[PDB]
Amino acid sequence: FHAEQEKFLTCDEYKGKLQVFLRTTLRQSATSATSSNALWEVEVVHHDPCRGGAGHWNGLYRFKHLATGNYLAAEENPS
Amino acid sequence: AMRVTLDATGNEGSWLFIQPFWKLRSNGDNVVVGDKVILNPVNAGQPLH
Ligand SMILES: O=P(O)(O)O[C@@H]1[C@H](O)[C@H](O)[C@@H](OP(=O)(O)O)[C@H](OP(=O)(O)O)[C@H]1O
Fold first, then answer.
1. Are A69 and A43 spatial neighbours (Cβ–Cβ below 8 Å)?
2. Of A23, A54, A62, A67, which has fewest CB within 10 angstroms of its CB?
3. The dihedral formed by the CA atoms of B20, B25, A36 and A12, expressed in degrees to the nearest 10
4. B26 interaction partners in chain A (CB closer than 8 Å)
5. How far is A4 from chain B (nearest CA, A)?
6. Where is the protein situated, by its record's location annotation (chain B)?
7. Cβ A29 under 6 angstroms from ligand 1
8. Nearest residue of chain A to residue B25 (CA atoms)
């Protein structure tokens, strides 16, 4: 949840591809705008693939879209 | 606007609420050094500009 804009990070298909965006809502309570497409699973990086456990501030994390299964990442901007 | 000055003795006009300028800060949270805040006079009601 991005507080400054009071928006949830959501991934959904627009034309033919999945894109990550912040969804605008008309609800008075921004936190009440809950959607299934805005659900992410937190993965803690561990040398053991099958090991999870509690995270640390100095650790590494991955974010996986629960609905689609893809992973959050960054790529080159066309502009 | 309303006048802002310095008074040796002071009065009720020196009362200033320290309000969070960032949405990530909420009332009752401890103020962290280096943060940006709003100084709102209690009686005047208009933040320092
Ligand atoms: O106030 P009402 O008449 O109940 O209407 C609700 C709300 O005002 C929005 O229309 C919508 O929120 P979004 O803008 O986030 O779609 C929400 O849908 P939801 O049930 O899908 O949250 C509605 O239920």
1. no
2. A54
3. 60
4. none
5. 5
6. Endoplasmic reticulum membrane; Cytoplasmic vesicle, Secretory vesicle membrane
7. no
8. A3
